[PDB]
Amino acid sequence: VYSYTEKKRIRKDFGKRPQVLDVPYLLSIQLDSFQKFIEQDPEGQYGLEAAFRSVFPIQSYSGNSELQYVSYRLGEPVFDVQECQIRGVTYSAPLRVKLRLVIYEREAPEGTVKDIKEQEVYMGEIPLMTDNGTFVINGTERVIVSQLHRSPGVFFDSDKGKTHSSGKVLYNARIIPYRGSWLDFEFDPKDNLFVRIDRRRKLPATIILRALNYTTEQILDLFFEKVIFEIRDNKLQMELVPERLRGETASFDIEANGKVYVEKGRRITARHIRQLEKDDVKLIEVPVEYIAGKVVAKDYIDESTGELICAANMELSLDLLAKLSQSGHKRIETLFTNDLDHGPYISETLRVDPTNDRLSALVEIYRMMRPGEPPTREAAESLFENLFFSEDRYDLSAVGRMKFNRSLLREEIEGSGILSKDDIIDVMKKLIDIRNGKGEVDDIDHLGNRRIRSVGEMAENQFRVGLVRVERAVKERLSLGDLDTLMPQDMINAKPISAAVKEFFGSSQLSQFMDQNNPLSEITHKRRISALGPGGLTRERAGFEVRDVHPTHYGRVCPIETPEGPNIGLINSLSVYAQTNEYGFLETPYRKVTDGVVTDEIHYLSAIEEGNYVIAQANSNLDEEGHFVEDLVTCRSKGESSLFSRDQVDYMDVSTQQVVSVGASLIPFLEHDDANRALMGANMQRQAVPTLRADKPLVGTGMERAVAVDSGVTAVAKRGGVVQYVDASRIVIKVNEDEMYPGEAGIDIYNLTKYTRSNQNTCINQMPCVSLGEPVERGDVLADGPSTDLGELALGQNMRVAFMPWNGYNFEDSILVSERVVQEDRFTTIHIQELACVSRDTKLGPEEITADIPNVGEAALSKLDESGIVYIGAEVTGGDILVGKVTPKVKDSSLRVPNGVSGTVIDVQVFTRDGVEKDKRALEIEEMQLKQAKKDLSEELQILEAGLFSRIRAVLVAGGVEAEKLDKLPRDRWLELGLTDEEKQNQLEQLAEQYDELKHEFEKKLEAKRRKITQGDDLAPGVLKIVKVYLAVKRRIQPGDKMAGRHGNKGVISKINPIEDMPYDENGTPVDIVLNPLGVPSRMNIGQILETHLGMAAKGIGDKINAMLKQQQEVAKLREFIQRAYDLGADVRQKVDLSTFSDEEVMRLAENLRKGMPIATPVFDGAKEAEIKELLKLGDLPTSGQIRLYDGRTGEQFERPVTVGYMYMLKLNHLVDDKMHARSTGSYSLVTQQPLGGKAQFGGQRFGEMEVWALEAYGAAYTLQEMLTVKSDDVNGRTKMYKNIVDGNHQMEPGMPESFNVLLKEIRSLGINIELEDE
Amino acid sequence: VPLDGGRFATSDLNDLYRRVINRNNRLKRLLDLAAPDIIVRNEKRMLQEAVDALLDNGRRGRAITGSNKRPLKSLADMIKGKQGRFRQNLLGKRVDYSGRSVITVGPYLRLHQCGLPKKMALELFKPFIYGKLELRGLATTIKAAKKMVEREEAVVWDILDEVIREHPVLLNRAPTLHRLGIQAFEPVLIEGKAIQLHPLVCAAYNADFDGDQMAVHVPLTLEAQLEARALMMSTNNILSPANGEPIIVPSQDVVLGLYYMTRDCVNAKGEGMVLTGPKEAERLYRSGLASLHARVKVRITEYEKDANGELVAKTSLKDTTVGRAILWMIVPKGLPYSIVNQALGKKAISKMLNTCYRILGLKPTVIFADQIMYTGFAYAARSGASVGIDDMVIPEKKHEIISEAEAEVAEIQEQFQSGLVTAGERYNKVIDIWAAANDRVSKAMMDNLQTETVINRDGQEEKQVSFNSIYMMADSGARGSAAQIRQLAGMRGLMAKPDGSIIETPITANFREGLNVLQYFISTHGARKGLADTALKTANSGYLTRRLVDVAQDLVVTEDDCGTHEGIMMTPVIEGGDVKEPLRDRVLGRVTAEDVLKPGTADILVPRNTLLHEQWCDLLEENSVDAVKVRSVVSCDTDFGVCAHCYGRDLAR
RNA sequence: CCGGACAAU
DNA sequence: GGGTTATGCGTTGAATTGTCCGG
DNA sequence: TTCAACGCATAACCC
Ligand SMILES: [Mg+2]
Ligand SMILES: [Zn+2]
Question: CA–C1' distance B214–C2 (Å)?
Fold first, then answer.
């Protein structure tokens, strides 16, 4: 049992490892990103509410006028989502915000004469999501690529190596707030540490702490040990500690129990650890000279003489010791400077700073930001509460606040958005600890050290910046303004906000122009993840490290997708099972196992959990509810295939499909061919264009249905059920009344899509594959779109192959194609072009639109109307005029058809502003446009009325019914019967009243369909009219075509060969294409021969069913052979049995199998070579599957048999047109006769540098005064060649260049003179 | 350029000058109101940066701008640099007189003609049509002459075809690696819509045959032909400048055609039975009676020009294969038949034509070598090439090898945890044993891949040269390297780990059976680095090439003899193993400095200042003299240049 | 006329 | 007081194609 | 608003 489309055509799937869950949808990064961007989400959490949280307080000055925020909502825009794109306007829903404004009276913080309640103030409009999750800016919808950037906060990297030619090991601590100023710290080769700002000049860090309302003692008392000494009459006894003698060699006598254990000149070892900690006597006979071996902490006043003994952080000396020993001061704490216990780094940076006080500690910060200004307390502090303690310039989100908590091993989660003293000291302590003996560094390439940003936050940021730039506006206009006698509409306007919000989405690095040529390219573009943009990774700045990615990304990112050329590894995506958290860090699911019992529960795990925890393997031998019968299972903890035991694993990989998402997952057996030598074919589907006719693949993987319904090109039954009627414009579907509502049940709407031209001349078309009377269900495809058939996916098509280089024509990569395609014309699509005819009112005679156009022919009047517009369906050639347009002086300045791009006029589109008189043709065009609307709504109205007839008569018969009021009664008066008053009667009344309401509900949009359609559009002032023509050119197969399949068959066509020269075989089957088995070592491409036999297997089955049904054997053969042909495989996870179904399902499904049996083979969990041979043996095919071939020229056998079979080939975009060009001579630049650039409109062509000097190196000296002198510079020599070649003489004397002498003219203004002499 | 309206858009050179003149107006106006020393001090600063702004910025502070955050375009931006006029007008400009079409193989042109299609050959030579209409009188005015060309009824192309043979054009390839990319091919007017190139020349440029770029160049004067007969063509420039190997490298599809041809069987079809005619043996070959590897002897006539060009009238009947005689009857005059008896691979065939130039000559040898592709096309048509699974044979001892390999790991790790060994040297031991643990499988697949094809022998079995399909091109050198064949059956080896050093866990299986995601990820992880680094090494190579090409260009030869009888000391440098380079590639065509004497008996070998081309060096190599004294380029008495004797002959000339 | 972005060898 | 070395900043970074929009 | 490689240049700095 399967779905109706699946039961209609069910594809065989293979596999030995059953899966538990299906494939979710991949469009979760735009719809979900924007829905949270615009919602009622108080406290912000990255939403418009977050924008309002910064403009919610608004305390004005001199009056305390409060402008509070209440709510915002967006209604239906003035323009829909299907006609605004056609008109060419900006799509924007009304961003209306309910703002309450209480302008308090002056001086009084409290008091208002009368409160003014602004109902939905108009600050502008923001784009919405039309039908797919994209933005619409200027006609064509715009897709902003999600940007990759680093995580907001502090990083710890090594960045060793180049250390000013010293080689001393160094580290750095780079901080990055959410959107504020960067505090990036680093180390010095001279064993120092300081602070920096925004990658700018260094700032002293041992003076700013004292500047922040601190003093000296809080500096020196928190970075060193304290060791109290004893001042007596002699030798200055002193009190030591094992926490000081742990690494400090006690070079003095240490007595314990009347004997010295550690004396001078010996190192304390483990035995001395016992000899010392077992005694730990404090009253030891320390000598006087060891007292000088310390460094004082602070100043001490001599208790005997009052003399300044020492100031701070200075080494004691024997004279100093005798200068304080003459007292009774038994409290002398000292520091502890070491080289391996404590960092000797803040020992000298204090002396490095010129001062450290209250006043001179601020002139440094005053002069670093505002030179030539006297220092001031308030101005100096303003920066401290601007770049460190602020809410509008420097602030961090919850992400930035909690990242530091984890980075510094904290416990709290939510705090403020500002830096704290504790954090800025701990970064100066754990960081100095990193050097000495502990610590670790974090790599930027790590997934947890980077942040992904999308449209949902970039738009919120833009709108919040927009609100903060207008916040102070009300404060300043209300500082000297009225007394609340206004309305909050004037000072807070819409033009600047709406223009900035709109431009910020269209003119940006991430605002990449959409390239609609493949629905798979549509999804690939939407899931494209890029690094460039505002605050990202630039292409010029790239080392060998940023180019290499952190290997811990398997199961989280698709590796097989990779850009080539200027950028490598810069374009990323999202895996199927894994997803990006709101934190931007990646995580992937795993199956929750226990020590012995495998549970089907799924948890989400990430790299940080993976580092410490051990994950088992997917393809692990399993039996009942789950037990690893094997003991030593290949596990992993840090990406290494660790071989660990069985009873510690609680998770393996969910499935092998979590690594690849969209790159090349449709190609089975990706292990045979490396992605390194397969990405040249795996990267060409992003530009491939669908053809006219496409066949189902014989071999795939099985994930084609989810990706097909994922793309927005199909018509899924969002509300399936009973299928009533299928139309070429709208599939008339509805469900029984039981599942919809008594009030306006309605019918299921499915409008059919017609041919259009989106971005890349792409003609999309949908065809209703369903029949008349075939029931469907929820989530069932109804109308097949491009490259789809019977609800499935088919991009390309299948054709047989041979492996035989004939006469060496396939020299490197060329291919040989016979005349089997050029006569059929099937491998081509339709491209619709567009040329814009500007009706600009030129000076001294505007541009008029009329048929009276000079220098035309008698054929023009037949194809042109009386207004100069070509007839609808009148073909044009090279040189015709689409719309007559002349400039009286008179010359024909209308549009001409260039030679080589001639097509057929199918659509002529005229855009004219309201006020300009139109021609009869155009008037008739909207005239027909309006009347088609009336009839097209009328049939919908009638079918809705008839459906409500079925619903109401159905409830009528169900219960009370009268024979007289049964069929002859009017179909409207269906609310007056003998039914008693109950839930049936009131429901019937509800149905009737809804029927009456819906019988007139349509008239509102009926009326709306004039005042928006009859009115003219608006494009730009200063032009009379803009008219466009959507000409379409159809091309055929011509010399110069290109071949590029899914396998990577990158080759250009060589020439044409006859079908007779095409080699036949023992029965003469015409082989479609023949490859060149020559580049196997250069291009390691082996994994195709084994899968080649699947094409023979499918054709063999299809032809056997065809022959077996041709004579129509009894059901004892039809249902027997169907059984055998559908029962196959050694261990498959799909059980299909058509014979056990009804006989009709047997024939109605066997009829779908005339050419082959679809096969779904996953790379790992699918059909293997053994399946290949068993299926070849299922029909009448040889075990080896090798077929001998005959010769078409001499008619013989060469030496060997040739493998022949069908693969699935697909078409690319570039054929000959993007490269074809031809030009001889004509117009050139204006400053000279230099040809223009590019080959598209008009210009010159490329040439290399080596031939430039190769010709000079040759003996021929005339090769230089021919190519760039009398070809591109000599204006009159050009006229000389024009005048004399047409006579016949072929000799031009070179004149003078007009490029070398031009440069000297502007330097002559600098005082340069030139002279001419001949020796 | 104007804008969308009645106004006009400004330029970079004027945007800032607008503001500096507007501010200068008010600064000068305030001067009449007795301005203090402050206004006069400040007004000079603005003119100082305005004048620096026009000249050049980005030296002091942040450069000013008037358009966006991007810096303004100064006067010294379009003159110098990558985008400057110096590298944009003469070094990558937009050239003219050329058309674009798709390249096909088209193995029809040989050296002289080309495959220029009809439309491409009609849409270019515009003025020559009007130049030739008036000769027969079809047109008397250019105005009316114009409106009989654009329609192309029957007379546009016949007139333009006869001016083709009287004026050859030049064709060059944009993706050119060598220096001799300029070859003279006469235009043709043939049907089709593509351009064909010589398959050897197409691979000669070493460019991907996937929609490359062509460029056509025509001489523009009469005197561009009288001198254009010896310089810009491949007829005389066969020798490559870089090396003694000429530009004509044997093709991969002809080398196999001769390597498998020279293969000798001991018992097959046509074995033993010998005919009495090379042509009748050839007929029995493609009639289905004689094999390409076969032992048949026929009356083959050999000739030698050891005389004064006189044919040595002789013949021979030796046991040859059937196609060697076919090649021999292509020799027009005659060469010592012993010269064609070899494996006929890369180097053997390369020095076939290399010595053929010096034996038979240049002009006939050109044709004799250009027909190699033609005569190998018969082989390509009759055999071709194919690959399949049956060529894969797993080694029989590989599974035992991999079974026994991991045993030592555990046997030493248990000693590590038992306190016998330390991971410091144990890790190095492990990565060293696994650095060679692939070699046993690598030579175990020799005896499982290249030793299979046997033949019968009078009733018994004889083993001879293997007939493995992938080994045909492997041993013949056509395609398939040692570093690639291991990737097929053997182990690809141990690549660099993400840490940077060698991986600790090698590759277990090959790409022919199942492979896990983790290790396939590791292999791709090691693999992308070469593709990443090729984007940068090529650019770095271009940097040095440009730094070394525009510096040595200024050289002129102004003297013939420098008047110096000295030079340098020539002796094959050798250190360590064997010497790789002889004197042959050192001195070849150079005027000797003085008379070299024989070391043994003091015999004058070269009498005076003479060249050293073929036989002089053959005298040196047979007399074993290492006292060569030739004029050296560094030691030359030539004013601004070097004389011809210090350099002598040059390659490609 | 100058850039951004995607894609191609 | 001659010579060595710490430290700031000068220059540059492949062949241009194809096509889209935006001032 | 994160370069790397190469290299002449002042201003200090070592006994
Ligand atoms: Mg190419
Ligand atoms: Zn000389």
Answer: 29
